From Swiss-Prot, chain A:
Residues 437-439 are cytoplasmic. Disulfide bonds join 49-114, 62-94, 63-96, 68-78, 259-271, 301-376, 306-380, 328-370. The chain holds residues 810 to 1248 of 1248 of the full protein. A lipid is attached at residue 433 (S-palmitoyl cysteine). N-glycosylated. This is Spike glycoprotein E1. The chain crosses the membrane at residues 416-436. Residues 8-415 are extracellular. It is a single-pass type I membrane protein. It comes from Chikungunya virus (strain 37997). A lipid is attached at residue 433 (S-stearoyl cysteine). Class II viral fusion protein. Fusion activity is inactive as long as E1 is bound to E2 in mature virion. After virus attachment to target cell via host MXRA8 and endocytosis, acidification of the endosome induce dissociation of E1/E2 heterodimer and concomitant trimerization of the E1 subunits. This E1 trimer is fusion active, and promotes release of viral nucleocapsid in cytoplasm after endosome and viral membrane fusion. Efficient fusion requires the presence of cholesterol and sphingolipid in the target membrane. It comes from the Viruses.
Amino acid sequence: YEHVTVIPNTVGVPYKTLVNRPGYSPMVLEMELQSVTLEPTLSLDYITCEYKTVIPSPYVKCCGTAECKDKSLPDYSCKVFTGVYPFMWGGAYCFCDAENTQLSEAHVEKSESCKTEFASAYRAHTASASAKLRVLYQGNNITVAAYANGDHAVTVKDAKFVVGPMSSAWTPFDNKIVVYKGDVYNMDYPPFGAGRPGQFGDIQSRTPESKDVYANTQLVLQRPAAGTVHVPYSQAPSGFKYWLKERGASLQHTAPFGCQIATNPVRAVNCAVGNIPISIDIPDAAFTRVVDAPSVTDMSCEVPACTHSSDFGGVAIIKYTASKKGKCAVHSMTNAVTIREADVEVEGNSQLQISFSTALASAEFRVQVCSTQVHCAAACHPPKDHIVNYPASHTTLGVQDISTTAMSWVQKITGGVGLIVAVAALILIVVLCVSFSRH
Amino acid sequence: RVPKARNPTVTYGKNQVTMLLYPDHPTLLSYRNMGQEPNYHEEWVTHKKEVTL
Ligand SMILES: *[C@@H]1O[C@H](CO)[C@@H](O)[C@H](O)[C@H]1NC(C)=O
Ligand SMILES: *[C@@H]1O[C@H](CO)[C@@H](O)[C@H](O)[C@H]1NC(C)=O
């Protein structure tokens, strides 16, 4: 037997459904959702880290002129200065007092620490989904796990389950994301080969083990001071350090719908959007014939208390007379009232007790116990606590749900006004007919 | 290793929450709405202060 149901995407709230097959007793199932996970598909673009500058010793040539050649190293620079007269700790360096020169050079490499401290840029695509459920089946708890699409089927204790697909395609990730030690950011990183001197992306590489490095920092050599041997220079400071000090809040604290974020691997969990359809196939041996189940012949209902809070604030007592000892199901026939209990045991001449929750100011509903129905009614009071720490366990109200006393007053006013129109119209019809006939 | 903060005092009203905070060193406070519009806010607290939300 095939059964189809729809469940809203809310974690921590149980739901019930009724299975009805001709010739057999009815059966009631209970389901509850524990977790939902989304996972995108990722592709690497490049990584960034800090840099190091290399300066070999200067070359001092006295009573002569020096020169330098070009090289292929990144950010290479050379320059020649004249008029130098360096000193050391024991006296002047070279005998000549004029026509001396100095040569200096430098270039840029990749730091050793990039194997531990780095950031990575990714491009994201369509995500998959998965879910896990708890089902109450013939008095026992069982658990299932499956992908949230129609291409997976599982079997537990000879029952087949298929879940999905989801009603919504909403995802919290954009096309470009950045990951660093557990944080995920949305950022439009610059193109490869088009870096900037003082922002994110001055140093670029394709993998931590690669040898090719692109660099776009500024490097200019300046004149040495009188009487000293050194190599001064000017350069823009590292952009990776600057980003760490002003990166701002992460995606976990700003995302909507209450989603949570994890990074190893990148995931998003418990986003409350949409709803999930479910299909179940029940074997024939699980049913009981109507002739073997007990019968119940007389019922009455009374309701001693009601408070329409967010928790189970109701109590009810039902009297019954049963033909033989057995088991029975309990199910509500209205949508605004929910009953916690799933089944009861009946014998002889006695009474049973149940609990319910509802948002109605005036409560009327029907209860079904083993193919018979009873009518209950009572009045309800409002609560006193303003704020609680858990969600409501009942559905919302419509325009048709109004207290019985309020409906009575609407009827008298509307009816009374309408009569005055009705009597006035009859006078008009008579007068025209007389005037027509007299002429 | 990093420390953890002291418990605040909370009172209730109609559609509002009142909190009294006891800082020992600079601490960050933040909150957001669940649903479609998060409305993020952020603030640093360095002394005794009272807030309503
Ligand atoms: C641990 O160190 C390895 C290399 O030594 C590095 O690849 C990894 O990212 C480090 N993990 C953390 C959490 O720092
Ligand atoms: C397991 O089943 C019992 C009923 O036999 C129920 O009370 C309990 O809540 C179930 N376990 C969980 C984790 O819900």
